[PDB]
Amino acid sequence: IIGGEFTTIENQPWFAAIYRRHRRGSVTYVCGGSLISPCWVISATHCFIDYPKKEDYIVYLGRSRLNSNTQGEMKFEVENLILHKDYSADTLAHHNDIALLKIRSKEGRCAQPSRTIQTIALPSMYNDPQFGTSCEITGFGKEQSTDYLYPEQLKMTVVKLISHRECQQPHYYGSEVTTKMLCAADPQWKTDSCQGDAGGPLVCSLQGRMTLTGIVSWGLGCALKDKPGVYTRVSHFLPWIRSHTK
């Protein structure tokens, strides 16, 4: 997250932190995700497509810090890693960038709701907020595009939704953006998602309900003029989600 503010997991208690194991004691951060039911985390296919084996990943819930443990966190292996079979990528835009992780602890359990572990509601189909609406994003990604390190403490920011008509202009993203994607950005381009934020939640309040409107997907750079963050549009994937979480 460029700009924005530090947070703890209480303020985004569906946020999942996803890590990869290595041949070497290297266990390293991969991407964010969102808890949509006790046994399911939703995230972006691009986070996993190079290494698509479920045993390579660990998922934490209840965690506010990147490389240190948070009191009350839970640790899960990945029982099933489900990628969207229509996934595609070019240099930039990822299509159908949506993934599900079925989570299971060493003891064979799913997430147990607490003050730090909660689910987020899915949108109703084709039901997104109007352009201009302020929503929130959350993640451990870079704070500056030139940084090498990721922040140790979770961050959040606010971005406003951009219409497909605005985002498809040539001086924004042209044909790279489809109606299965949502653009979002700050009026001054001063705050944004960045590398290491993929897979995390774009949350909007829709009729009183905190809603998973989007999943962090791609962008050109971070916090660049006329180059919004791009998000998988969750409300266009409900049948995919309904089927695969069985």
UniProtKB/Swiss-Prot annotation:
Highest taxon of the lineage: Eukaryota
Disulfide bonds: C31-C47, C39-C110, C135-C204, C167-C183, C194-C222
Residues of the active site: H46 (charge relay system), D97 (charge relay system), A198 (charge relay system)
Modified-residue entries (Phosphoserine), positions: S145
Effect of S145E: Abolishes phosphorylation, proadhesive function and ability to induce chemotactic response
Glycosylation sites recorded in the entry for this protein: Q144
Boundaries of every Peptidase S1 domain copy: 1-246
Name of the featured protein: Urokinase-type plasminogen activator chain B
Taxonomic lineage from the root: Eukaryota, Metazoa, Chordata, Craniata, Vertebrata
Residues of the whole record sequence present: 179 to 424 of 431
